[PDB]
Symmetry: C3
Subunit: 63 residues, 3 copies
Amino acid sequence: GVSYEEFQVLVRRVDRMEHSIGSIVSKIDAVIVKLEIMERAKLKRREVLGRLLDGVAEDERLG
Amino acid sequence: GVSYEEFQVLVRRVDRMEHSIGSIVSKIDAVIVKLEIMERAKLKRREVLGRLLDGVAEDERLG
Amino acid sequence: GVSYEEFQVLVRRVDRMEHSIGSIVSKIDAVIVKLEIMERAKLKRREVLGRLLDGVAEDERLG
């Protein structure tokens, strides 16, 4: 013996949970895409600075 | 024809899921606040080291 | 008055949500373990480069 109102209460909770899960998935996904934008930016930065240091080494010895 | 016990089983599953969603939201949020504490700390670190390098350049040329 | 079919519809939604929550938990957890693998790798890298710089300082003054 379960009434519609009892049932509807559970449906509304599930509706809000489904909306929270949508938001959470979007948030975790954005974290993951941002962490890779950061990782890519980092490797490039270390290479660019690496090339400047190659230049300091060459000038120190031959300049 | 749905019995209370059938229904109650679904309510208990939803209760545990709601608790998992609370924990997940707290976890994702902590990740995001920590990543910004890290990002801020990083920019400061690069600036502080940048100022020491400015000092090496000045001393190398005028010391 | 709630029919099994009405109820079953909510059970299937809850089943898919439970599967999404499992996936989300695995994803957030992997983010957290990866961020620590990265943090550990970083401290080691700064120490190793720190030791090379100690070497440049010593050679500059005594070489």
